[PDB]
Design a protein around this ligand. Structure first.
Ligand SMILES: Cc1ccc(C(=O)N(CCCN)[C@@H](c2oc3cc(Cl)ccc3c(=O)c2Cc2ccccc2)C(C)C)cc1
Ligand SMILES: Nc1ncnc2c1ncn2[C@@H]1O[C@H](COP(=O)(O)OP(=O)(O)O)[C@@H](O)[C@H]1O
Ligand SMILES: [Cl-]
Ligand SMILES: [Cl-]
Ligand SMILES: [Cl-]
Ligand SMILES: [Cl-]
Ligand SMILES: [Cl-]
Length: 347
């Protein structure tokens, strides 16, 4: 029940906002666990939302990682597949958290830097934690980009100038999907990752257009796979496998409020499907429904094994308080509410 979780993150509106003239009545409160926004004459109305964990504008980037990650890794560290994703409108800090951030000016080491997102924060933990554990481990890192009816591998530009790749299901496992030439190179050195990592930004960064939706319209999935072998004085050798998936998603503004002027139509479309496929797939899992349409979305199909195998999943929604975008906040809220169902606390 508990393992599936929903997190919504709220921060103070950007300083640059004034030119827009956007007004933010939006609020985020952790202690209450509920976020309410004034509907605004008829402005007394305030939206009531309930989540187990709700990030605030004050809240540190580190605090979120410990809350949702610092917990998943141990299960994942044990050798259980887990998925952490950020969905919602665009530029809500998902990439900064997901791809991390670097403090302005000359700065402490990246692990040292406060700014960095889950991947940098998530990545920093694995090497250090293992050292304390002392178990032998091998690291494989892979990155993916989602374009409709197309798949790309960030790590290697080799063998391809820049072409879409087909995906193949595997007979040995009915659930399993196999992609040829998929590039995951296990990390020889943890320090080494940045040089290897540096390529991912450049290749994705250069090709974003036509495209034209890159970052904003592309989920972009980065996955880390761990192989662990630990000994024992009583031991003996024990083998465990850990897979962690970290991803970024398109903006949540498109999704309809329930019984919205537009819900299916607003959320409707081929581009729409990955988000829509996720809600039914994600929504179905919470319910326990016999049939889950993981198949409909390519991203969903790949994710099935981690979800399908015993796993823990955390679902994240990001919002902006400012008046200037009406659509993004509602779509995130409907998606979060729809995806996760919780009774609303009444104060
Ligand atoms: C503390 C911190 C956090 C994020 C960044 C950052 O902005 N990155 C670029 C992507 C957009 N935020 C990071 C980053 O860059 C990548 C570049 C390529 Cl080509 C492929 C993958 C990455 C990637 O996963 C990250 C995430 C990251 C990891 C550790 C520290 C910081 C960020 C740093 C390695 C600079 C820098 C420092
Ligand atoms: N809490 C925050 N405080 C200050 N700036 C933030 C915060 N969250 C996000 N940002 C800013 O927003 C930008 C990141 O948005 P981005 O990573 O492009 O998201 P997306 O890829 O979803 O568009 C960065 O310039 C970062 O400085
Ligand atoms: Cl807020
Ligand atoms: Cl809020
Ligand atoms: Cl912890
Ligand atoms: Cl722990
Ligand atoms: Cl198939």
């Amino acid at each position: 029940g508990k393992n599936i979780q929903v997190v919504v993150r709220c921060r103070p509106f950007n300083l640059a906002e004034r030119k827009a003239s956007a007004h933010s009545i939006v609020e985020c409160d952790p202690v209450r666990k509920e976020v309410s926004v004034r509907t605004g004459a008829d402005k007394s109305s305030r939206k009531t939302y309930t989540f187990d964990m709700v990030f605030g504008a004050s809240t540190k980037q580190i605090d979120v990682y410990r809350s949702v990650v610092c917990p998943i890794l141990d299960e994942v560290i044990m050798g259980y597949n887990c998925t952490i994703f950020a969905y919602g409108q665009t530029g809500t800090g998902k990439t900064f958290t997901m791809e991390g951030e670097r403090s302005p000016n000359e700065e402490y080491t990246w692990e040292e830097d406060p700014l960095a997102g889950i991947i940098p924060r998530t990545l920093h933990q694995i090497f250090e934690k293992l050292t304390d554990n002392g178990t032998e481990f091998s690291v494989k890192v892979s990155l993916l980009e989602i374009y409709n009816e197309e798949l790309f591998d960030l790590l290697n530009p080799s063998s391809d100038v820049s072409e879409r790749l087909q995906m193949f299901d595997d007979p040995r496992n009915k659930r399993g999907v196999i992609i040829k030439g998929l590039e995951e190179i296990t990390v020889h050195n943890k320090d080494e990752v940045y040089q290897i990592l540096e390529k991912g930004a450049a290749k994705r960064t250069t090709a974003a257009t036509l495209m034209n939706a890159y970052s904003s319209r592309s989920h972009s999935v980065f996955s880390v796979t761990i192989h662990m072998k630990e000994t024992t004085i009583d031991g003996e050798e024990l083998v465990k496998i850990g897979k962690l998936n970290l991803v970024d998603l398109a903006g949540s503004e498109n999704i309809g409020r329930s019984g919205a002027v537009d819900k299916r139509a607003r959320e409707a479309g081929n581009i729409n499907q990955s988000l829509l496929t996720l809600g039914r797939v994600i929504t179905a899992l919470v319910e326990r429904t016999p049939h889950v349409p993981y198949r409909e979305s390519k991203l969903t199909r790949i994710l099935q094994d981690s979800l399908g195998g015993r796993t823990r999943t955390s679902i994240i929604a990001t919002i902006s308080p400012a008046s200037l975008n009406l659509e993004e906040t509602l779509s995130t809220l409907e998606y979060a509410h729809r995806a996760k169902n919780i009774l609303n606390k009444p104060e």
